[PDB]
Design a protein around this nucleic acid. Structure first.
Ligand SMILES: [Mg+2]
Ligand SMILES: [Zn+2]
Ligand SMILES: [Zn+2]
Lengths: 917, 72, 241
DNA sequence: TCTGACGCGGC
DNA sequence: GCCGCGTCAGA
């Protein structure tokens, strides 16, 4: 097949471990001290693991092309590329066997479950604390019978031979060895055929599975106790020398250098026939070092080096956030990248971005090299490198022609949803900061107070076409979470529009007549008319109907000088009835949505272009600004406070003579201050949103043109609460818990506060400020979990054929519908048909709803239908293209290949950074 | 986005994924044919977009495109 | 947020309620030792009693006599998440979950289509407990893919050979995460020591078949343009053949 | 801190 | 067959 296509894991017999070994390690040596060459047969022996340079032995004799596959003879060195010092293991010979820590302390202990004994009973045997019958013998003892030293002595006294009870790893290994399976499987399966698994045989269930597995695989169960353990290629635990004439060992070198000389001393002891006490001590010290090497800290007080850190053992490299899996397998600091500070650049188009010519010169350098060479301005590579180092003039031209249509990527650090990454088309700029079209700073969730973006380049022909087709900003209009658009004008693009789209009663040129847009333009530039005047315009243009018709519309309409100025940008196809209103944000979004759903996708991006280009223009000819007299304190504030404080004195009276309790006094005081603050707040609304003027004839109230009122009646930036705290009064400040303080703050920000009043507020200030930082890790946690749960849900097949789903209905909450049926079930296909209460069918099974057909549900009075949920698909390990419905991001039936699971995962926890309580 | 976009191409081929693979095959073919005679790629666009234009103008009929792989 | 957390990880909250799928009488009369039982069997047509022990430190949710159905509320409090799956069926559980989650979301200005929530719910429902020993073992947990394939193996090969009887079980999201098949993805997620040392015994094979494995080894993931390739290139064979 | 899954010991 | 007390595993 030439490509492996399965991966399997298994236990390593001591005959496989030798088969891996290109040698054997014998003395705990790493590198000679005076000269830094490897040592004979230590932990860097070039005879075993490989050479150091390329095609060159250590003693340097065999150094010529004549002899390549040759094996030197002064040093045992081979001759081959040094690249084998990372794929060539070794091994170590163990005098006495030693238990693989994992299969003992993994909870549940597979050794324990096998031998059917409690762990501590095993560890006692292992720690040289008892004995255990290995030879049954005629003696009445039991095999797995722990015997203390003196009871063992008495067994020796009364029975002598005919039974052996050894202590140490050899004991466990012998037991596991002489443990027949077919003697045991059925014998236990019969006790399980005696099923009374209320408490007893709720235990015996696993041993079945374990003993069956060990039979099925073909693994000798005694292999869980090692007799020879391997070593790791040296270039995975290097000893490279670095500045300061010093070296940088790895923590593994030390644990290896320990296990080795402990094994050595053990062999020497066994040789010299020492007393059994120190034999025991060595045989135990060895087990300890082995366990430390595997993963120290599982059982003891894990060893530390001079710096007193717990060492980074073997297993501690492939777990944890800093480990090996989610650090360097899904990590990978990549190349062809850069990062800098973002700035605005309101001249671009929705598919462009600034790019400092320096970062451009850097990221594209090899492309520049190729084009110079082929261009015939340099012939070598050193040539081009030496001519780019000095920034020749032709370099800039060739760079600019390199990137004519070579998109890049842009990304902002906390990347919560797929709109966190989009593709643009660069264009050179001077300076040292990235510019990006403003209409997208909502997707990247960016603002220009210092955020920095990264930029990666695609290289292939498939990639840099996949970025073009699936990733360019002009494809991402609607949000995957919900069909609502994502590129709507945001902050003062909205101020200007709302401003020039209002009306005024007595203005200049009022009631005039104009034939077409150019007329109004010519007029308005002459400076006679007020832009808020009411005029009459005669229009004539096509309009698209719902059903694909396109009927003509004409006549005279009473409009405003401002709105007509927007008549130019509206493309042919949409009715003027959209622009002919006051144009707060909720309507600009309406315009864009309507445009997309009927006219196309490109029409929408061009429309948003012109909308920005105009809103920016007219939002500065109006010079909106903010003084301090624009914040108008209401007039009845002092007396409205006097009433409240008098009532408070009265409540304190009712208490002081013990006429009322405490808690009720507290609660009623709370309500007093709350209601009065509400009143004084509601007052300034009329005190700032209305302005009367003795217009010709009399004084009549009109909607004010105040600045701070317009900044918030247009949803641009603000809300009623901030206005309250500016002009009204702060009110109730909750001490850390949330229990309100029995003194409210009567002043406001235009008036300033006394020391105590500020202090009372800093409590909640700090609490709310600290509560975000202590969340920023939690939502990421939840979305991580969710991505795991459903990472492999892919739309794979058109239809699953089934006919079962769920029953949907408007989700009343006893006080309101709060979600209509005609909105809950939009764009989701129908399980079965639907019968009128008069009898005739209305909609058939398998009929994807649509805002045309979704009239026919509230029309005929229906309140329950059956739709195809993915809970009730019928395909295995996937999803059909119908039990899921509309893509809700491109307004079509889901194309086959959209990884729906990931989208749904990150469209749940993403807004979670905001939902707090 | 100079002249042609995905919204155009999506009318003939479908699912917007098949577009990627088909255009990639076509651009590879146009690339390996030595079109890089270097007096043209400095006056016009990269083949990666030439292929998209070719698919938009409905010249190639991707049913045909695959039949150029057997021509490999 | 932690409310949502509780919803997803399938937590049975503190002292929610009790149920009884053995319809019958509704009464008391057993020993009043915080072990109050009932007469939930017929006791007239079928002389039996099918009740369970329970304390007496609260109120009650039935009178001295009633026609108690199979799975009605027998004590007030929250609603367990593990009961509805086996008592009210599937769809009731689904409706409960959606009306909870979309409420806790919309109540803060957010907007989220349901079809995102349900395609998460779906992955919490990949495991059942087996009843009829067709060829697998007893009530141990098993995949619905495993059952749904081996059932169909027997379904026509031999005769149907009395394939399977099972019942869906509800497990949390982390619990349904680690309990997958591919040992590679599970080993990447968390608790690596345990999963590695467990799969080491069973000589576990792992067909790649997923998204977080072709990435560990650098292959076209089996989605997106990957399936587009596996389709278009496959369509070349039928021509050149 | 926790929250639990999972224990495995007193009775 | 269970009321409290542990370890492990992630925050
Ligand atoms: Mg910022
Ligand atoms: Zn030599
Ligand atoms: Zn389906």
């Amino acid at each position: 097949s030439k490509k492996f296509d399965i991966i399997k894991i298994s236990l390593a017999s001591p005959e496989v471990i030798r088969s891996w070994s290109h040698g054997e390690v014998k003395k705990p040596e790493t590198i000679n001290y005076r000269t830094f060459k490897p040592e004979r047969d230590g932990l860097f022996c070039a005879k075993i693991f490989g050479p150091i340079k390329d095609y060159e032995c250590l003693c340097g004799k065999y150094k010529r092309l004549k002899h390549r596959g040759v094996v030197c003879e002064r040093c045992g060195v081979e001759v081959e590329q040094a690249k084998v010092r990372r794929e060539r293991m070794g091994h170590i010979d163990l005098v006495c066997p030693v238990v693989h820590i994992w299969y003992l302390k993994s909870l549940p202990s597979r050794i324990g479950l096998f031998l059917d004994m409690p762990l501590k009973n095993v560890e006692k045997v292992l720690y040289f604390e008892s004995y255990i019958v290995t030879d049954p013998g005629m003696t009445p003892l039991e095999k797995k019978q722990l015997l203390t030293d003196e009871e063992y002595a008495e067994a020796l006294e009364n029975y002598g031979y005919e039974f052996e009870a050894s202590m140490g790893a050899e004991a466990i290994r012998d037991l596991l060895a002489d443990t027949d399976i077919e003697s045991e499987i059925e014998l236990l399966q019969a006790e399980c055929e005696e099923s009374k698994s209320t408490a007893k045989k709720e235990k015996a269930i696993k041993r079945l599975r374990l003993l069956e597995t060990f039979q099925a695989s073909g693994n000798k169960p005694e292999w869980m106790v090692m007799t020879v353990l391997p070593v790791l290629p040296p270039d995975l635990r290097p000893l490279v020398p670095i500045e300061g004439g010093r070296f940088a060992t790895s923590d593994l070198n030390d644990l290896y250098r320990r296990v080795i000389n402990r094994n050595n001393r053990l062999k020497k002891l066994l040789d010299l026939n020492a007393p059994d006490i120190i034999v025991r001590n060595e045989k135990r010290m060895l087990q300890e070092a082995v366990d430390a090497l595997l993963d120290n800290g599982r059982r003891g007080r894990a060893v530390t080096g001079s710096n007193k850190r717990p060492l980074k053992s073997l297993a501690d490299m492939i777990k944890g956030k800093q480990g090996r899996f989610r650090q360097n397998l899904l990590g990978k600091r990549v190349d062809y990248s850069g990062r800098s500070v973002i700035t605005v650049g309101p001249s671009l188009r929705l598919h462009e971005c600034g790019l400092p010519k320096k970062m451009a010169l850097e990221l594209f350098k090899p492309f520049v090299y190729s084009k110079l060479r082929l261009g015939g301005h340099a012939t070598t590579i050193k040539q081009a490198k030496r001519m780019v180092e000095l920034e020749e003039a032709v370099v800039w031209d060739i760079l600019e022609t390199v990137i004519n249509e070579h998109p890049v990527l842009l990304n902002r650090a906390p990347t919560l949803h797929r709109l966190g990454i989009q593709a643009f088309e660069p264009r050179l700029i001077e300076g040292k900061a990235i510019q990006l079209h403003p209409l997208v700073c909502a997707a990247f969730n960016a603002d220009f107070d210092g955020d920095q973006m990264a930029v990666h380049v695609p290289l292939t022909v498939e990639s840099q076409l996949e970025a073009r087709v699936l990733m360019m900003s002009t494809n991402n209009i609607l949000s995957p979470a919900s069909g609502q658009p994502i590129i709507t004008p945001t902050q003062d693009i909205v101020l200007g529009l709302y401003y020039i789209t209002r009306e005024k009663e007595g203005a200049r040129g009022e009631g005039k007549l104009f034939s077409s847009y150019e007329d109004v333009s010519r007029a308005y530039n002459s400076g006679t008319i007020d832009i808020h005047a009411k005029i009459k315009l005669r229009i004539d243009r096509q309009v698209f109907d719902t059903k694909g018709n396109t009927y003509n519309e004409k006549g005279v309409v009473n409009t405003t000088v401002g709105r007509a100025l927007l008549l130019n940008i509206l493309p042919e196809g949409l009715s003027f009835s959209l622009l002919n209103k006051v144009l707060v944000k909720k309507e600009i979004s309406k315009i864009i949505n309507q445009a997309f759903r009927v006219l196309g996708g490109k029409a929408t991006v061009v429309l948003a272009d012109k909308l920005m280009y105009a809103g920016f223009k007219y939002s500065t000819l109006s010079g909106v600004s903010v003084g301090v007299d624009d914040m108008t304190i209401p007039d009845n504030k002092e007396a409205k406070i006097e009433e409240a404080e008098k009532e408070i004195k009265q409540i304190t009276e009712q208490y002081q003579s013990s006429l009322i309790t405490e808690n009720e006094r507290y609660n009623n005081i709370i309500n007093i201050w709350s209601k009065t603050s509400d009143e004084v707040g509601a007052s300034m609304m009329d005190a700032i949103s209305k302005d009367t003027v003795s217009i010709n004839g009399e004084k009549k109230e009109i909607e004010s043109f105040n600045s701070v009122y317009m900044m918030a009646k247009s949803g641009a930036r603000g809300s009623y609460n901030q206005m309250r705290q500016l002009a009204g009064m702060r009110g109730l400040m909750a001490k850390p818990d949330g229990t309100m303080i029995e003194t409210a703050i009567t002043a406001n920000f235009r008036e300033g506060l006394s020391v105590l009043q500020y202090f009372t507020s800093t409590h909640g200030a700090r609490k709310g400020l600290a509560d975000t930082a202590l969340k920023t890790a939690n939502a990421g946690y939840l979305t991580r979990r969710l991505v795991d749960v459903a990472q492999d849900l892919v739309v794979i097949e058109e239809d699953c054929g089934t006919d079962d789903g769920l029953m949907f209905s408007a989700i009343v909450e006893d006080g309101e519908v709060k979600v209509p049926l005609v909105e809950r079930a939009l764009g989701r296909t129908l399980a079965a048909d639907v019968v009128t209460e008069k009898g005739v069918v209305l909609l058939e099974a398998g009929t994807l709803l649509d805002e045309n057909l979704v009239e026919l549900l509230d029309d005929n009075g229906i309140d329950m239908i059956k739709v195809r949920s993915p809970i009730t698909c019928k395909t295995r390990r996937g999803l059909c293209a119908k039990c899921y419905g509309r893509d809700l991001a491109r307004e079509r039936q889901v194309n086959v290949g959209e990884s729906v699971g990931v989208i749904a995962a990150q469209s749940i926890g993403e807004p979670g950074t905001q939902l707090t309580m | 986005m100079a002249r042609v976009t995905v919204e155009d191409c999506l009318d003939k081929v479908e699912t917007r994924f098949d577009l990627v693979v088909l255009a990639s095959m076509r651009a590879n073919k146009i690339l390996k044919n030595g079109y890089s005679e270097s007096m043209e790629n400095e006056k016009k666009e990269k083949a990666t977009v030439v292929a998209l234009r070719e698919i938009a103008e409905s010249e190639i009929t991707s049913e045909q495109i695959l039949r150029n792989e057997i021509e490999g | 947020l932690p409310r949502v957390a509780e919803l997803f990880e399938a937590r049975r909250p503190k002292d929610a309620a009790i149920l009884s799928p053995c319809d019958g009488m509704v009464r008391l009369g057993n020993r009043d030792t915080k072990e109050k039982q009932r007469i939930e069997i017929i006791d007239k047509n079928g002389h039996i009693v099918e009740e369970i022990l329970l304390p007496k430190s609260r109120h009650l949710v039935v009178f001295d006599g009633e026609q108690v159905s199979r799975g009605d509320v027998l004590a007030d409090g929250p609603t367990d998440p593990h009961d509805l799956l086996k008592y009210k069926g599937l769809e009731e559980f689904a409706d409960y979950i959606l009306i909870e989650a979309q409420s806790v979301y919309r109540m803060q200005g957010v907007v989220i289509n349901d079809k995102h929530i349900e395609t998460i719910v779906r992955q919490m429902l990949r495991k059942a407990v087996i009843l009829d020993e067709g060829d697998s073992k007893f009530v141990k947990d098993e995949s619905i893919e495993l059952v749904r394939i081996l059932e169909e193996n027997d379904k026509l090969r031999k005769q149907g050979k009395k394939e399977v009887e099972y019942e869906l079980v509800l497990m949390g999201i982390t619990r349904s995460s680690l309990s997958t098949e591919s040992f590679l993805s599970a080993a990447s997620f968390q608790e690596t020591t345990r999963v590695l040392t467990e799969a080491s015994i069973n000589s576990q094979i792992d067909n790649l078949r997923g998204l977080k494995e072709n990435v560990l080894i650098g292959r076209l993931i089996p989605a997106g343009t990957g399936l587009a390739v596996r389709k278009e290139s496959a369509k070349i064979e039928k021509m050149r053949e």
